[PDB]
Design a protein around this ligand. Sequence first.
Ligand SMILES: Nc1ncnc2c1ncn2[C@@H]1O[C@H](COP(=O)(O)OP(=O)(O)O)[C@@H](O)[C@H]1O
Ligand SMILES: [Mg+2]
Length: 306
Amino acid sequence: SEALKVVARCRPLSRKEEAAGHEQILTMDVKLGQVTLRNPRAAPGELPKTFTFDAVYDASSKQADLYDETVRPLIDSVLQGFNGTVFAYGQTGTGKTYTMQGTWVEPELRGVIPNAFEHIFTHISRSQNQQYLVRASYLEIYQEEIRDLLSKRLELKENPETGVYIKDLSSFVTKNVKEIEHVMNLGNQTRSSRSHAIFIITVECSEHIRVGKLNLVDLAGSENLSLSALGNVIAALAHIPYRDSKLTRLLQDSLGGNAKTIMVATLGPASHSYDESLSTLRFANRAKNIKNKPRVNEDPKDTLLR
Ligand SMILES: Nc1ncnc2c1ncn2[C@@H]1O[C@H](COP(=O)(O)OP(=O)(O)O)[C@@H](O)[C@H]1O
Ligand SMILES: [Mg+2]
């Protein structure tokens, strides 16, 4: 058993936003993992609300910090045959994509996905007397239709032993960071604030075989039936209605199941979005009272897939 780990990230205030006359209202205390929100429409005597998380990251926080401190251990577990999930929840414009992919490709500015690639293949090539098979899949849920970004409309099936899976989901084998970076490139080329993006990395490992799955999820902006389903599942967990959306059926394991999960609550510092921030913080605050039970995974001799 283990708690869902929630962390907060806040992007900088923009010139554009200050030009419009918007005050900053989000403050963080990085030592204490805390977020504080001023209500710009607050009565005299009212105290800001403070939320506490496992870690917080503010405007001056760098991409490597967030990776090495919060996410790197999740990916080391995946390398040892655990299932892991990272997902970014937040208002459009607050940095879900910046966090997950990066907007820039340079090593210092990459997001969690391209760093996970670096991490994974460095480990592999440091490894000895051990064969790893890495496969990557890249899909999108839009209007509760699963689309395959690397092909199409795909269907969801729930078999007894194996579990919940997707029919005909393409899944490319990747020897390199170069090769797995090409897959993500072609996926992005096929693709945004209304859709959910899921990047899946599997690592079969033989020394005698383990398998770890990693879901790297960039959700639709919290402003959409799937965000509502996720809203209700979290609330029940913290009868869970997983079947109310394609998204919550897929993340079934990451939310009260067989996986290590990290939520990245992404926030904007500005006064025009007090209510959207509040909603995110409250949601991130429920999420941290969710308990998963991650196990290490066996893998059959026969894992032949196309
Ligand atoms: N921490 C950050 N530091 C610098 N720029 C950021 C940060 N977070 C977001 N941005 C930038 O602000 C914009 C919004 O980020 P994005 O990830 O696209 O938001 P979302 O995907 O949640 O809609 C992008 O241009 C992005 O490059
Ligand atoms: Mg985005």
